[PDB]
Design a protein around this ligand. Structure first.
Ligand SMILES: Cc1cc2nc3c(=O)[nH]c(=O)nc-3n(C[C@H](O)[C@H](O)[C@H](O)COP(=O)(O)O)c2cc1C
Length: 362
């Protein structure tokens, strides 16, 4: 077994390869999109993970697409996250913040000024996001048609990622993960399905990847390349965003570009919850030969699949999502071959302590 052996992940050393995937739980305070001590307790419970990757966190108020998702743009958010990271560190854990802009997976009612959310192009996501009703409970609501960003707005978006990274470093995170997956803003630019622009940010794969690579360069400059990871979902369809008619070649282009920056890790979200065709081993080999940082695999993994792919030299670590919701001590359970706690999906999104901090350890 290799899952319980250490791994250098850029600037930090994980004691094992069992990572906590980023999981949106929608329990932040409004007004202010503020993390809470309850969230702190939840993360502290999971500190034995090789690496915790936080729930997706707004780089700016405009970035918001979900009621209850936290930000990392305001003083009050910075202060609240500082307490959370301190708690994880007191338990000898490591925690990365996943930073997003939701782009068109959003609703005007939660945007600044009540305005349409932004994207690469003015095309509805044709999906839902999560708002809160009058009692503060999560509700699914159809997405608002976005406004296409003007060319002169792009530097501001890059700066918002840069600023959020400055704030994340201050807040005590060990790493940052850029959310370039699952049909959110960066992926909206990457995908031809959502990007119909005819300027330098659309058309060719070079142009479609331009924004994400500008963001990577800006955040490496703000902090250090060995503090930066990126999550992609570049093969298949996620929240109605496919990866276009040349998905493999386009993915390999992006990955070769990322490699030039010497970033800490590449996190591949391989499938959504409904599943689909597995990655070919040929594709995994092509990725592996092009990227020289850590590769994290995710999407309905088992420990056995993770061991197989680590043993084949194709990935370095695995991120578990739902098993981490339900098992604060997932590392010990996988090490001991213990049963896993029964998941309660009704409390994944929104609410309070129930279904959040009340899953027991062994
Ligand atoms: C409730 C829930 C929230 C999620 N939130 C995020 C998120 O904030 N960021 C992200 O990149 N993926 C998110 N995902 C996807 C998970 O990180 C993970 O890739 C997915 O659940 C599949 O892995 P699993 O089979 O181990 O759960 C979420 C998944 C679930 C079920």
């Amino acid at each position: 077994e290799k899952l319980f052996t250490p791994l250098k992940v850029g600037a930090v050393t994980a004691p094992n390869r069992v990572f906590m995937a980023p999981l949106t739980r929608l329990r932040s305070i409004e007004p202010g999109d503020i993390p809470t001590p309850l969230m702190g307790e939840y993360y502290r419970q999971r500190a034995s993970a090789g690496l915790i990757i936080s729930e997706a966190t707004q780089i700016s108020a405009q970035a918001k697409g979900y009621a209850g998702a936290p930000g990392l743009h305001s003083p009050e958010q910075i202060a609240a996250w500082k307490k959370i990271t301190a708690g994880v560190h007191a338990e000898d854990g490591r925690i990365a913040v996943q930073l997003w802009h939701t782009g068109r997976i959003s609703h005007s009612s939660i945007q600044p000024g009540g305005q349409a959310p932004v994207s690469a192009s003015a095309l509805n996501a044709n999906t839902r996001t999560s708002l809160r009703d009058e009692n503060g409970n999560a509700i699914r609501v159809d997405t608002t048609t976005p406004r296409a960003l003007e060319l002169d707005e792009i530097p501001g978006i890059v700066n918002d990622f840069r600023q959020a990274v400055a704030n994340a470093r201050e807040a005590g995170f060990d790493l940052v993960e850029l959310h370039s997956a699952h049909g959110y803003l960066l992926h909206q630019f990457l995908s031809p399905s959502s990007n119909q622009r005819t300027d330098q940010y659309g058309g060719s794969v070079e142009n479609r990847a331009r924004l994400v690579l500008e963001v990577v360069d800006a955040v490496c400059n703000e902090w250090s390349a060995d503090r930066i990871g990126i999550r992609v979902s570049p093969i298949g369809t996620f929240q109605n965003v496919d990866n276009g008619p040349n998905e493999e070649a386009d993915a390999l282009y992006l990955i070769e570009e990322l490699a030039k920056r010497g970033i800490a890790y590449l996190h591949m979200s391989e499938t959504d919850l409904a599943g689909g065709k597995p990655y070919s081993e040929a594709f995994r080999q092509k990725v592996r030969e092009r990227f020289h940082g850590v590769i994290i695999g995710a999407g309905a993994y088992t420990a056995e699949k993770a061991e197989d792919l680590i043993g084949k030299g194709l990935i370095d670590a695995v991120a578990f999502g739902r098993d981490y919701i339900a098992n604060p001590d997932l590392v010990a359970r996988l090490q001991k071959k213990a049963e896993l706690n029964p998941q309660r999906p009704e409390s994944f999104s929104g609410g309070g302590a129930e279904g959040y901090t009340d899953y027991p350890s062994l």
